[PDB]
Structures are given as C-alpha cells and as structure tokens.
C-alpha cells in the first residue's frame, strides 16, 4: 500500500514531462510556422545567436566525415577572420557535436534501408518563386528541434519531483506543476528560441538540484550519489558557461545549511567530492578553457571543501552566532583570495561583463559595452508588468505564505544562539531550497531574463503550503487537509486557464522578405571568399546562410571580440571617413552590411542609440559631422561622390545597405 505510491509518483512525473514537451512543441509550431517554411527560410528564422550555434551543426552534418567536420570546427578560420580559433571550448558547442554524431549515422542507416523519414513537396508562397519544404524526423531542423525539446521537456518532471520531495505529498507536486503551467510564459522561452544554450543547460541544472535535494533529505552517500551528481553536473557545464555561476549559487545555499547543523558530515563530503570531480571532468573536456578558472565556481568549491574538512575540529563550539560568523568569514576570505589571487595575481583572462552590468546600474559608470548590454531590455531591471502577471496567478502570495510558515516553524523548533554538534536540525532540504530561492530572486530582480531561475523556484517553494509538518501537523486532522488543498487547486484553475488560452492563441510572423533578397544578392554577386562585416545580428545570419566568412559575430562574452566590435561599429561614429576606411582596410573586411534604421535619431531614449554612444565614448571628436548623415545622404542621392574611398554596392528599398571598401 506504500509501494503503489511510488509507482503513481513516477507515472505522474513522466506524464507531466510528456505534456510539457507537447506544449512547448505546439507553441513553437504555432509561433514560427516551421511546417510550411522554405528550407533556406528556417535558418533566416534563426536570428542573431541561434544562427551562430546552428551553423556549426549544419557544418558538421555536411562534412565528408564526422571526424573531418569536428577537426574543421575545432580550427575555425571564418568565425573571426584573421586568426584560427577553437570554437568547441569558446562557444560550448557540445550539444551540436552530440546531435551531429547521432544524426549522421541515423541518416546513413535510413538511406541504406530506404526508410521514408523525410517526405516533402513544393510550397507555393505566391508572387515569390515557389520553394520546397521538407518535414519529418529526418529533416535536420526537425532532428535538432526534437532533440532540444526532448531535452527541455523534463523540466516539468524535475519540478514535479522537487514538489513531491519538499512536501512529501503528491499534492505538493501537483501544486508545483500547476503553478509552472500557468507561469510557463515567464518561466522559459524555449518554444521561441530553441537553438540557444540555456535550452540545453537548464534541464540538467534542475535535475541536479532535484538530485541534491534528494541526497540531502535522505542523507545518502557513497560512490552512487557521487556518480549521480556528476552525471548531471558535467553536461550542465559542457553545454553553457553560465552554469559555472549557477552552481556557485548552490554552494552559497548549501553552505548556509551546513553551518546550521542541517546536513550530516558524510553527505556534505559526498556532495563536495561530486562537485570537485564534475569540475575536473568539465575542465579536462574543454581543452582547459582558462575562463573556467578565475570564476566564482572554483574558489567557492575549494573554500567549501576546506570548511567541510575542518568542521570536526570545531565540534566543541556551543555558541551558534560565533560559529556561523567564523564560517562565513573563512568562506568569503578563501573565495576572494582565490579569485583575486589569480585574475589580478597572474592576469589569466577573466571576464568583467558580469561585473560591469552591475556597477553601471548603481554608479554612473557608462562605458560602451555596458551601454550595449543595458539597452537591450533583457539585461535591465525586471519590469513591473512581469510581477503583475505573476501575482495574478497567485504564484507569489503562495510562495510568501509558504516561506513565512517555514520561517515560523524554524524559529519555533530551533535554538538559535546555542548549537549541539551531535544532533541534526531536520528538514535541511527545505532550507536549502529556500536559500536558493532568495539567491535566484535577488539575481532576477537586478537583471531580467534570469527569471528563468526565479520562477521554477517559486513553483517549487509553493509546494511547502501542502506539508503536514509545516502547517500544524496533526492538529487539523486528515479530512480538512485534503479539503483545504482541493480548494486551493480549484482557485488556481480559475486564474490559470486564461493564460494558457492566450499562449496558445498567439501567432507569429514569418515574412522577413528584405533579408531574403539581400542574401540572394550576396550569394549571386560576390565571390566565395569575400569577408563581411556589419551589425552583429545580420552578420550571424550572413554566416549561417551564404557561408561567407565574417569578422564579428553575436557571441560577445570573450575578449578579443570586444575590441573587434569597438572597431567595426566605428562606422556610426563621428571620426573622419579616411580613418574609418583605413580601419576597415586594416581589418581586411570587404563589405559592410547594415540597416538604415540604425542611424536614425531616437530623442526618446538617448544613450541607447549608436549616434549617442559615440558621443561620450568619443568626446574629443564631438562636434564633427556624424557619419550616419553621410550614409543617409549617399543612399538617398544614389551618387556617392563625397564618400570617395567607400562605394555603396547594394541599396534596396532603403532598408539594407551593403558598402564596398575598395
């Protein structure tokens, strides 16, 4: 009678996972209309970043042999024309490698057996030339998308299992999944942007969090738990760089639990060993990417390890505030000494973009790159409308009630000042999840687009409202508890259906005719070895289709590209035209492709348009005739007489412009 429970839990978890996958797939097909799109048109649907990553999957699946393709993409000389780079450890293209390795032999076998996996026919767009669209599991785009969606459809199962664990009742899991479904649009954007990296690294992060909660709750240990943690930590680091920081939150939330006598010694040792092993495997797999070191995930691991390995030496301390304060001081000291003792100590790379989107929000630090980051509206403060939509589904108030209940219970049932080393506190996983929720919320509020972490944790913590121990224990009988939890679920369904209705009703647009003509022109009227340079979103697609070498791309994290962008974007500045021509010639670029909408005054949000960003960043040159006026004049007049070194080659319907540098 207690075994049929586990079967139902597992079955419901799998069913909710499958339903989530179906939902994401349906939303994707509704938004983009991949069903009846030209094959060369889906790639154009893959915008600024999506195009870059998918280009390497397309390159690998096309090469004579998988080994030859991997060797090509590990020595890429076209992503950043001028020098050879290794794209596997720079862009984290392991998902593409795995997908191509699976696809190539699958398609070879399908051809061998004559199995009909790709069946397609012509699509008559209309006035434009008819195009051919192919659909099925064999079509490369469907294979990639199905892989992405299968990998990302287990987030529902992970959330359901987390709700079942921290609430020890199927009602907790139901509350978690229901809260996730109604707040789906604000939880993930995998149905609108598959090819990104987060779509691959979030499911594994959530799985690892669930596994860690399970380990903490039952106080497991041994080689089994270490292997289980590594199997989900390695993939989440090989798929996306930001995982290195996400894991840094866990060590910040695990530590707080460890210092509160809520985690045994053996389980803490197992967790830390699994983290160390996963980091070592990840570092060895990425050709020793230097940026892995000097991050906040390595020093944190070492500090937590030393704290764990010296805790028994302090078993005699009985004053909790002193213990906690000393542990926090040692943790912070080690973390900052390691991070500061290597980055500035040895000058080993290090990326300041994370630290520059924060000083620019508090101080007056303007800069140029931070200006690009802060004006995107997905690196800015989370807007009020998102909170309005979340509190509409009551996802927030339930989280607040559950958190207040848990804090009340912890205060009542714990002696805060004085500590006993031998006895464990009990309910460690709940505190761990609560601390991660606060960390994630503090992240999300500063920067939008990190609601990806804040919303699933809200769904999880909303399940504490169904715990028997947290909510009076046996003081409320059993008939009442079921009735109280059915009423809550009935209330939610009253405020959740409209959200699903709106999400399904939404329809996307797929016209984008200008870029198709521009790419036709590029394919027809230029050589195969020309070098292109221009605005970062256009160059990504220029590389993805037409296979022309590019000078700057949309991947902006690493150094060596920030200075390339600072030079390429000089065309919109007020510098003398001769100097910009010299810069372009030195870089070796042949064509500069941009849009006439980039050089239009805003007068509504200054310091977010290119004309303005080059005023502060280029103040000594202030007062000179801005180039944008020169480009507009040359485009409209059609005779580029005043701009001698340059010469407009392509100008169609005054939307896209291609200049040729002699």
């Amino acid at each position, epitope marked *: 009678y207690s075994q049929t429970w586990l079967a139902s839990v597992v079955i419901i978890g799998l069913l909710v996972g499958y339903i989530n996958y179906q939902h994401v797939y349906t939303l994707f097909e509704n938004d983009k209309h991949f069903s009846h799109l030209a094959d060369f048109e889906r790639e154009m649907a893959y915008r600024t970043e999506m195009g870059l990553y998918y280009s390497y999957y397309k390159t690998i699946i096309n090469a004579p042999s998988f080994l030859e393709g991997v060797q090509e993409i590990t020595h890429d000389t076209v992503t950043e024309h001028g020098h050879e780079i290794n794209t596997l450890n720079r862009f984290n293209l392991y998902p593409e490698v795995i997908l191509a390795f699976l696809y190539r032999p699958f398609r070879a076998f399908a051809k061998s057996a004559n199995w009909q996996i790709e069946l397609c026919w012509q699509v008559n767009r209309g006035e434009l030339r008819p195009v051919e669209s192919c659909e099925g599991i064999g079509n490369p785009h469907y294979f990639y998308i199905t892989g992405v969606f299968i990998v990302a459809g287990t987030v529902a199962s992970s959330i359901f299992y987390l709700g079942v664990l921290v609430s020890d009742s199927i009602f907790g899991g139901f509350l978690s999944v229901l809260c996730f479904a109604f707040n789906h649009g604000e939880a993930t954007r995998v149905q609108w942007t598959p090819p990104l990296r987060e779509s691959f690294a979030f499911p594994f992060i959530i799985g690892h969090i669930a596994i860690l909660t399970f380990v903490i709750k039952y106080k497991k240990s041994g080689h089994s738990m270490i292997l289980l943690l590594t199997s989900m930590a390695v993939p989440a680091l090989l798929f996306w760089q930001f995982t290195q920081f996400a894991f840094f939150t866990q060590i910040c939330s695990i530590f707080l639990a460890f210092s509160l006598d809520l985690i045994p010694f053996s389980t803490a040792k197992t967790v830390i060993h699994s983290h160390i092993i996963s980091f070592l495997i990840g570092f060895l797999l990425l050709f020793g990417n230097e940026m892995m070191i000097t991050a906040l995930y390595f020093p944190s691991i070492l500090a937590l390890g030393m704290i764990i390995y010296i805790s028994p030496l302090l*078993s*005699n301390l*009985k*004053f909790r505030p002193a213990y906690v304060l000393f542990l926090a001081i040692i943790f912070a000291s080690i973390t900052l000494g390691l991070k500061i003792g290597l980055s500035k100590g040895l000058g080993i790379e290090d990326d300041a973009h994370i630290f520059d989107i924060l000083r620019s929000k508090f101080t007056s630090f303007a800069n140029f790159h931070t200006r690009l980051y802060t004006c995107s509206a997905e690196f800015d403060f989370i807007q009020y409308s998102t909170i309005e939509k979340l509190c509409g589904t009551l996802l927030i108030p339930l989280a607040l009630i559950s958190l207040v209940t848990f804090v009340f219970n912890f205060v009542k049932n714990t*002696n805060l*000042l*004085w500590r006993n080393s031998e*006895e464990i506190g009990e309910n460690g996983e709940i505190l761990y999840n609560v601390v991660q929720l606060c960390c994630s919320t503090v992240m999300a509020f500063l920067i939008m687009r990190l609601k990806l972490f804040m919303t699933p944790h809200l769904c999880i913590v909303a399940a504490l409202f169904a715990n028997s121990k947290l909510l009076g224990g046996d003081r409320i009988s059993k008939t009442i508890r079921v009735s109280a939890l059915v009423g809550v679920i009935a209330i939610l369904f009253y405020r959740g259906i409209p959200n699903i209705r709106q999400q399904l009703n939404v329809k996307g647009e797929y016209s984008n005719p200008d870029q198709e003509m521009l790419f036709d022109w590029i394919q027809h009227n230029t050589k195969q070895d020309a070098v292109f340079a221009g605005t970062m979103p256009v160059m990504a697609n220029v590389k993805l289709t037409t296979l022309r070498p590019i000078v700057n791309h949309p991947h902006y994290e690493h150094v060596g590209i920030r200075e390339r962008t600072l030079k390429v974007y000089s065309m919109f500045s007020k510098k003398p035209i001769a100097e910009v021509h010299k810069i372009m010639k030195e870089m070796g670029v042949n064509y500069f492709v941009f849009q006439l909408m980039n050089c239009s005054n805003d007068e509504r949000r200054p310091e977010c348009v290119y004309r303005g960003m080059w005023d502060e960043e280029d103040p000594k040159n202030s007062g000179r005739t801005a180039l944008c006026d020169l480009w507009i004049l040359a485009a409209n007049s059609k005779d580029n007489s005043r701009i001698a070194p340059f010469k407009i080659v392509y100008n169609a319907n005054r939307n896209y412009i291609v200049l040729k540098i002699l």
Partner: antibody
Amino acid sequence: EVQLVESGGGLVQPGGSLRLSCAASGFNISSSSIHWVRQAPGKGLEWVASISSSYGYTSYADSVKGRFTISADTSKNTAYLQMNSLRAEDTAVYYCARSSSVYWSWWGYSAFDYWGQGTLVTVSS
Amino acid sequence: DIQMTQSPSSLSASVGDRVTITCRASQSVSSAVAWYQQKPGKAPKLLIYSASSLYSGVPSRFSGSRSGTDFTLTISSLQPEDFATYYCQQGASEPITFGQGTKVEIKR
C-alpha cells in the same frame, strides 16, 4: 577584593512586587555576565535569570519567562531583579553568581566562580 | 531543557574513604560541566570547572573525570571538613540546569 552582595529580600503578599539588587565590588560589571539563581527550602539550586550587560543581553528561565525583569545599571556597577505576580512557590533564597560574558561565551558559559551571600524572599498571606 | 542527573542521591562514607559521585547528561554537553560544593547555611563554591580542571585554591585531593556523556567526581580520602552536598552543573546551553545533589554523611 571581588565580591557580590545581594540585598532587598524579605516578605511580600502573593501577587506583589519585589525589587532586589546585586552589587559587585571590585571587578566592573559589563565585563562579565551575572546570573540570579534560586534555591527553595530543602531543594536543589535552580537557575532563574541571566544578564550580560556589556551590550545588553538578557535571558530568563522558562518557568519565570514573563514575570521577572533583570536590568543592569553600569553607571554604579550594580544589577537589579524585579519580580512581579509572585506565586506561592517562588519563596526561596536567591544568589548572584558571576561568569563570562555571553558574547565571549565561546564554548559555553564559564563556571560561577564568585557567589553572593544570598537573600531570602518569602510570599505569605 | 537539558537534564543533569546525579546517580547516588545519598551516599555515606567514613573518614579517609575514597568516594565517587556520578553525573549523566541526557544531551551531549561536551566539557561544559562543573562541580560545586555546598555546606548548609552558606553559599556554594566552585570545586571543578570543565569536568577536568581543579579550581585555584581548593585542595588537590578532589578530581574530575569525563567519559562519554558520564562525568565523575573522585575524592581520594574524605575528611571531616568536606561533609556537605555536591552539585553537578552544565553550562553549554541557555537553560543552565543544576543536578539533584548528593549528600555525604558519616557512617556509624
């Protein structure tokens, strides 16, 4: 030269209020915690209240958590216990014992090295 | 809410006989225990602090010992002066709980 002296004990009707003092001569208060300990007639010692006057920390025994208040007057180096709503079982001898300050507790309270003479308080009708 | 219990609620010994008093803590106070001596009509005084150290001034005959959660006070040879109650105190928690107390008398 270090010595605790308790004063203010006597007789009181049930439900009344008493206000007794522990004066320390020698060592200065606020450098170490002082505890008020109870002994009923023919029984063992019982812990009543504790005050660490360095930064103003106070703790009370669960049995009298809500009827007793200990206040430290660092100007004259003395402490006071105010007891109100006396029951019929609170008649006893009260001692004032010194120990390490709570903030420097650090592996637990130190032993009550120096004790006072002790004052008897009785509730009768 | 941590209880310290003394096993020999009453013990009788004559002059010069070795004596042993036991104390048991329900929880696991590490070494925050102490032993006080109270004679009738006066206030208690410290005899052992930390369950192993002898307070400065008291005769060296008294000794303290710890083993597991058990604590013991050992007197090598009782003398007419040390005939009074002995209390076991714990100071590793906010509620400082004393022991019941054992009284040593003269056998006859």
